[PDB]
Design a protein around this nucleic acid. Sequence first.
RNA 1: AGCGUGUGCCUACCCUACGCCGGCAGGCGCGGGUAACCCGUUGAACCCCAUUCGUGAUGGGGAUCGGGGAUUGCAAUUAUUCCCCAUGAACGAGGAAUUCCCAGUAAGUGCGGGUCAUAAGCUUGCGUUGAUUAAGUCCCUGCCCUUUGUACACACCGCCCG
Lengths: 72, 139, 143, 120, 189, 54
Amino acid sequence: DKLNNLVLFDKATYDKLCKEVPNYKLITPAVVSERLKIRGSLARAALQELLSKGLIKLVSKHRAQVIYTRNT
Amino acid sequence: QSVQVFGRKKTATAVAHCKRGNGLIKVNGRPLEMIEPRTLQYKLLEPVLLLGKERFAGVDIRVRVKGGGHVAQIYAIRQSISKALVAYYQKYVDEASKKEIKDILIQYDRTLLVADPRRCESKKFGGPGARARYQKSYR
Amino acid sequence: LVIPEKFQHILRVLNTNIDGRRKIAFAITAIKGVGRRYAHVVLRKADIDLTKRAGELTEDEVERVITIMQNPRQYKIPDWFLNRQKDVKDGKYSQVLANGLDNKLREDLERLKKIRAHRGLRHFWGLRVRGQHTKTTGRRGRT
Amino acid sequence: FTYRGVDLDQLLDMSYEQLMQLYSARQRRRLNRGLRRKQHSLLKRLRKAKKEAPPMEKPEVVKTHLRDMIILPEMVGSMVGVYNGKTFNQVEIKPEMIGHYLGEFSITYKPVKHGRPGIG
Amino acid sequence: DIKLFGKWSTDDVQINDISLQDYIAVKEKYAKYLPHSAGRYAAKRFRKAQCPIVERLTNSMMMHGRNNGKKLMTVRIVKHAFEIIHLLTGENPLQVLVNAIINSGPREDSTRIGRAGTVRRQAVDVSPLRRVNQAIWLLCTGAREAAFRNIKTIAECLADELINAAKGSSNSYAIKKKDELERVAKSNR
Amino acid sequence: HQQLYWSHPRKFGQGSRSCRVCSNRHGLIRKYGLNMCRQCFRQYAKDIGFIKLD
RNA sequence: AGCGUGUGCCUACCCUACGCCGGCAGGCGCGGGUAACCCGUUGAACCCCAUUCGUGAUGGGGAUCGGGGAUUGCAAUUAUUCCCCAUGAACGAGGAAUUCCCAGUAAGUGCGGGUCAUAAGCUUGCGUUGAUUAAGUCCCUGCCCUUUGUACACACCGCCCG
Ligand SMILES: [Zn+2]
C-alpha cells in the first residue's frame, strides 16, 4: 500500500525516537523510516542531533549510507 | 645515485624518481593519502604496507603520472613504486635484498612488476564496437 | 526542529489546493505558472530560509510571497523570468498564474483562429504544430 | 485595437527603425538585414492600389509570389494574393496579423481525410 | 598481516563443507587489502577458482544495465555491507560470507530435454563450482530485487540477506530458490 | 534574362559543389581538399597514393 | 584521456587563446596557428567526495504546447538550430516472437571524423570504467564430407494420383 509518513516531529513518536534508538545496535536512515513510520529526511536530520547528544556512536558516514550504533 | 623507472597500465605512464632520501613518497607533488580515489588508497599503499616503512626509509619518491584514467593511474603508480624500489636495491644494494623484496612483491600480485599488456580492440563496421554487431531483422 | 503545532496542512493560495507538508520551494510548484525555478527566486527575494516546510510559515511570510507573484517587477526579478515577456496586446511584462494561464493561452490560440493562420488551424484540427513528422508518431488517442 | 500597447494610428507613422523594436526576433532581424529590391516594389504596388481605390471600396486583389513578406502595419486592409504552389489565394489583411509572414495564409496542401486502407 | 579493508582479518574464517574447500578462496594467501584486483581470471577455464570470492561478489553486484561498469560503486557497497553485517551479528563478517555461499547453492539441478513446447526434464548432480557460481548469483539478485522500489538501500538489503542465507532462513530470496530448484529436481529424480 | 538566369545565390549548400571528374553533386569527399565523388575517389585512390593497409 | 581536424584552383565557407559587455544563447576588439611551434598539459563524461530529496506518477520522466531573446542565411512561416521562463502526457521493466556476443569482450560513458552557410537521436573511428557465464554439443537452425534411395534434373518451391 502507499506510504503515509510524517514530515515533522510528532508528540508520541518523539518519545519513540529518544529511548530505543540508543537501544538498537544498528541505526540507519532507512530502518528508522520503516520502524517509526517517518520520511527519510527526519531520519537523516533528526538522527544527526543524537550524535551531538553524545548518546549514539557514529560508525561510518557516506553520501548514500549512514551507520549509527549505540554506545557500550 | 638516482633511479627512474616507469609503471604502466592501459595508457597511463607513472614514472618514479628514487634518490637517497628519508621516505616522503609523493605523487605529482602531493602525499599518497590525498590521492583522490581514496577507495583504492590501499591499492596505492600496497608496496609500503607489505614491505614495511623501514625498507622505504632510505629513499624519496616523487611520482609523476599522465594518461589514462583514475583506476588506470592507480595501477600505474603502484607498479612504478615497486619497480623503482627493486631497481634501487639492484643498483645500490645487493642482489639478495632485491630477491627478498621481489619474492614478496611477486607473491602478492605479479602486476607489481610485469606490465598488463591488454589494450582496447578496434571498432569494426557492422557493429557498435569490436565484437558486437548491429541488430538484424527478417523478411 | 521540534514538534510543530500551528500546522496549516493545506494552503489555499490562488484557488489551488497546494501541499503543506512538502518543502517550501516545491510546494509553490503545484500551481500553474510556477515551476521549480521560479519559486526559488521568489523565495530568495522574500528572504526566507528554504530548509523549512510549508506548514510552519507565519502568515506575514505567507502573504509576502504571494504579493511578489502579483507584481514581481518591483522586487528586481528580471524580465527573462516572466511567463509572458512582451505581450502582443499591451506589451507588458508579467508572470501569468493559475487562474489566467488557461484564460490567456486560450486567447492566444483563438487569436490565431480568427486570423485563419497556419498554426491556429493546425491547433484546430488537433494535429502537431511545431513541424514534427506526422506519419509514424502521435498515434495514441487518435482514431 | 493595439499591438504591444500602441494603437494602429501611431503604427502608420511609426518610423522604420522604431517599429523594429516592437517585433519579434525573426522579424526584427529581417528588418535589420533589410527589405530587398523585389520587396520595396510590392509596397509601392500596394500604395498604387490604395490611392487609386475608391474611398468606400477596398482595393483590387493583387497577385504575389512573395510568401516571405512580413505584414507591416502600413499594409493593413489590402487584398493581396499569395501563391500556394498552384493558385493565387485571396488574402485580406486585418490589423491583428501584423507580425506574421504572408505565406502562412495560402495553405500549401490539401488537409488529409483518409480513405479505406488497402493492402497494408 | 593482511586485513580486508584494513580491518577484517581472515585467520578465524572456517569453511565448513569439503565440497567447496578447494574452490572458495581466501583463508591463506588470497588475503587482499581490497576486492579490486583487475586480474585476468577469465583467461582460462577453472582459473576463476583462484580469485578472492569478495571480488566474485563485487563483480556480480554490478549486473544490471545501468551499473555495468561501476566497480568502485560496488566495492563501497560491499564495504558498507561489511559494517552492517558486523553490527547485526557481532563477529567476523567473512565467516558469514562463506556460510552464505555454502548454504545457498543447490546440489541437484534438472536438465531440460524435450521438443518445441514439451518439457520432460531429468535430475542430475551439481558441480561444486557451479554451486559457487549459483550461490553468489542468487544472493546478489536477492539483494537487487528486494531493494528496487524500497526505502532500504543496497547495503542494508545485501547485508540482511547475507546473514539470512547464513542462518538458512526461508525469508531470504537465495534459500527460497535453492529449495525449489531441488524440489522440482526431486519431482523427477 | 541578364539579371536572370544564373542569378540565384549559389554561395554555399549542396548544389554549389560538384565532383571534379564526374561533375556530380552527391556523395562528395571534401576532406583534405579532394572534392571527388565517393565513387570516383575509389577509382583513382591508388593513383593519389591512398593505399588500403588495414 | 585517446584517435583526430583546422584559413580551401573554381569557392563564398575555420580551429580559435585572451580582455571587455551580457543570466544565458551570443556581441565587440584583439592575438596565434598552412600546425609535435597555436587552440592544447587537448584542465571530456560516467567515475570519486560533500548537501538536499525520501518510495508517491514525487523533485523520476521529459513528450506536447504559450510567450520572449540570439546567431546562420538572399529567404527560417509547415516551428533550421540555439538560449530563458512556463505547461508537465505516456511510461511501474514489458505477451507471442526475436537479435548480438568469449576478454580489455558485453554493457556503461563521453570525444573526434563524414555529412556541415546552419546542424547528429545516424554512421565511422577513439579512449575511459569494466564484468557474469563457456572452454562444449549436434537438440534446433544451417554448411560440409562419406556410404545410398530416387520414375528428381527451365532439380522437393520437384515429379505426380484420383
Ligand atoms: Zn564523381
